[PDB]
Scaffold this active site. Structure first.
Site, mmCIF file in Angstrom:
data_model
loop_
_atom_site.group_PDB
_atom_site.id
_atom_site.type_symbol
_atom_site.label_atom_id
_atom_site.label_comp_id
_atom_site.label_asym_id
_atom_site.label_seq_id
_atom_site.Cartn_x
_atom_site.Cartn_y
_atom_site.Cartn_z
ATOM 1 N N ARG H 96 5.592 -2.871 1.878
ATOM 2 C CA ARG H 96 4.411 -2.067 2.181
ATOM 3 C C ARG H 96 3.239 -2.432 1.277
ATOM 4 N NH1 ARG H 96 2.555 3.442 -0.254
ATOM 5 N NH2 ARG H 96 3.025 2.051 -2.020
ATOM 6 N N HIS H 101 -2.275 -4.075 0.609
ATOM 7 C CA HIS H 101 -3.239 -4.630 -0.333
ATOM 8 C C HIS H 101 -3.642 -6.062 0.002
ATOM 9 C CE1 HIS H 101 -2.374 -1.028 -2.542
ATOM 10 N NE2 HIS H 101 -1.150 -1.408 -2.861
#
Lengths: 130, 124, 131, 128, 131, 122, 132, 132
Positions: H96, H101
């Site tokens: 994740r 990011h």
């Protein structure tokens, strides 16, 4: 100093007890009760001389002995007692050790010879110190 | 090291105080570091253990340093000998100091004879 | 072998304490029989110390920091009960007075020990023998 | 601030582990590992409190602490904690040396009567 | 000297208690009480070694130690301990902060010390016991 | 504080070193506290080898040292290095990449956990 | 700055991904998959904008952003973005949080209104930032 | 516990959405839109699990997470989840973190491996929890 005064009075008080108790000497090599009294009062003479010696070594800054024999050595090395007296009082301590903690090997002839001939190391110590 | 502050605090807080000693590192040159200030006292009675620890921390706060406060009346014979050997008397009569020293050194000499075999064992 | 010897002199010393005391009668009055009792009481205490110190040495229980500490070490390793450790350390204290300042030895306590606490010596040798 | 937050959490974790390990006290005087655990957690509480005090002294520009005890002295001089709470936290600094047989009674005493001081300190801090 | 002697006894008592509490390791990993006991007893070992070092530095007049670690380098510079033993005892100085890192990550360190550096304390007290 | 000694010891002992930061009190001497050093390398450091290396720094600096592996360190601790750290070595690009990744992860963490810290802070 | 340049490129790539996937709009409110893809590329646009903001606040020591939105707030207080653009970017983030974390409460029409009328905020942010 | 049941339902709907969109897999790698939808719903599953873990961390005062993974560490530390399962969920957090990011560095091959072999790590976590 009150320490020396009281130890000295103890030494005299106890050597008189040894003499009164060991009278004619005939009741000595048999009779353990009077042997016990002589041996105890000899220990009390030794302990009082050791206390005097311990006290003087600390005050005169000679070192702190961790054994009673080193204490008398320290007084001899700094010439506060003659070495003849040092080694004879070491002998008394050595004889107390055997007499108190191990009678079954105590000669008892050495005790009686100390009672008659070697008490005169305690007076000599009392007289020097004073 | 402020010895007068040590003396006043203990005198003010210990009934029937008789002897104050500084011992350990802070006597005989003071050792900086985080090392404790080691103080020994003799009073007429044994101190309460918890009250003694509290007094130590009160000295610790006044001196801004860790303090170890030893009650000589319950201390070991080894420890009493160390105080007698390396200690610096801060308060009390000379006669009380000599009574304590004579009693201590005698007890220590008898202990050394008793335990010499244990010491020789563990040192070889 | 030392423990057998030390136990032997403890029994032998307890016996000499019992004869010389006999009946209270006059032990408060004649100093020679007190000297025999006091010395043999000291011998019992010091034989127990050396029993303790022999065990402390062979089992590496530690280094006694005082004479009393010889029995504390035994108790911390569960070789003696702590009520008995406490009673023997009371004997060490009397030993300490009798050897260092014999004149403060209160005799009512000496006779309290001859009367009621010689069993602590016998209990100690009975425990040590049993191990 | 994460240092304040984490130190507070460390203090409460250590207090609960002291209460849990000490229990009623019946076994405490027999198991040397329960003693070790309680002592170590007392020292952790004390160190975390010193870290909070030093972080506050710096961040709010109160002064520069010259010792662990001075960390709390600075907080009290500026009335961030009270003088008795400060004095009680200073007492706890001594525990750093309690590890290095009768001081077991000190440890029990501290568990029973001074754990509230760590909780009183982090409550004063939580209220900022 | 009783300081040296008692510190040596403290180190051995602490080593024995680390070994018996750590034991086989199976349940050391998740019983915080055993972890706390080992950490504290490691810190006592470290402190006791530093005190021995400082006492020797003083009585041998080797210099005033400028730090906990400097106390060992003074011993090494005068050839009373070897350099790798000195280095290993300096590594143990770090242990005083192992409890106050607030992070398992350090517990692998603790088991590493128990298994590979515990011998460094034993080596130190044997070197000292020469005297 | 001798920053050249810290740099040389880390460079000689950490493969694929990328970043060295000084953080904590020494980046702001202060007191008796540890010197806090954070490193990022291409691989994560072995935990025990990191501790051993910290004590090697500790011996050379004559002071307690805490060596932090940024690649395995918590997001909170990475945020502290990013916020207060003094970079001792590494390119400026690698520092900026590390900051952006860290600050983003931290902001997302604050969202997830803010009820927990509200609850803990009374 | 290479970080600024790559984040710019990502915002552009992802806006085109949104325009391409949303198409004419006839199928958006019906197809979960097209919503998923628009929502994800909105998130990527937001994260690229936030990374730029976090970077500049640190590079220029403008402050520590207490949150992703506070990072836009700090840029506005330093007059590097306008207060209106700051506020629009901040409500973009809020829409992202709803779209991603709480889709059942998402109003799909605000996403469509954003796709039609507010993708320019990302491009306006790009232009101001690079006009440094 | 009202929040936990809502999060459990969101995970179940997102798991089905992933299975639906991934299909047999034969077009997953050539349609970016299917990649977006699956990746997004993977993120939602992970973050819904994180919210579940933090709800329990808060209610039982297990600690303050220092990172997103630490949220699962705390439940494994207190034996409320399987250590095998904690490690798997934390790996999912790492996926994740990359997706949110720096999405370009996602490895589609691990995305596929998670869809085929690791989605029921979520399902293990759901049942365990629920049987509180």
């Amino acid at each position: 100093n009150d320490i020396i005064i009281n130890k000295i009075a103890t030494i005299k008080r106890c050597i008189k007890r040894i003499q009164q108790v060991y009278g004619d000497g005939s009741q000595f090599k048999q009779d353990f009760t009077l042997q016990d009294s002589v041996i105890l009062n000899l220990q009390r003479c030794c302990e009082a001389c050791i206390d005097i010696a311990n006290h003087i070594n600390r005050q005169q800054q000679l070192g702190i002995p961790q054994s009673s024999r080193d204490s008398f050595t320290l007084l001899a090395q700094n010439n506060l007692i003659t070495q003849p007296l040092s080694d004879n009082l070491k002998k008394m301590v050595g004889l107390r050790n055997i007499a108190v903690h191990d009678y079954q090997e105590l000669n008892l002839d050495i005790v009686v010879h100390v009672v008659q001939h070697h008490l005169e190391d305690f007076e000599q110590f009392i007289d020097v110190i004073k | 090291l402020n010895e007068n502050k040590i003396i006043k605090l203990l005198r003010d807080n210990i009934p029937k105080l008789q002897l104050i000693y500084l011992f350990g590192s802070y006597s005989q040159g003071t050792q900086h570091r985080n090392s404790e200030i080691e103080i020994a006292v003799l009073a007429a009675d044994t101190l309460d253990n918890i009250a003694r620890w509290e007094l130590a921390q009160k000295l610790a706060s006044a001196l801004d340093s860790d303090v170890d406060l030893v009650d000589l009346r319950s201390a070991s014979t080894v420890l009493c000998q160390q105080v007698v050997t390396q200690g610096k008397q801060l308060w009390g009569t000379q006669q009380d100091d000599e009574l304590f020293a004579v009693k201590t050194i005698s007890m220590y000499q008898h202990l050394q004879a008793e335990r010499q075999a244990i010491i020789d064992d563990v040192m070889a």
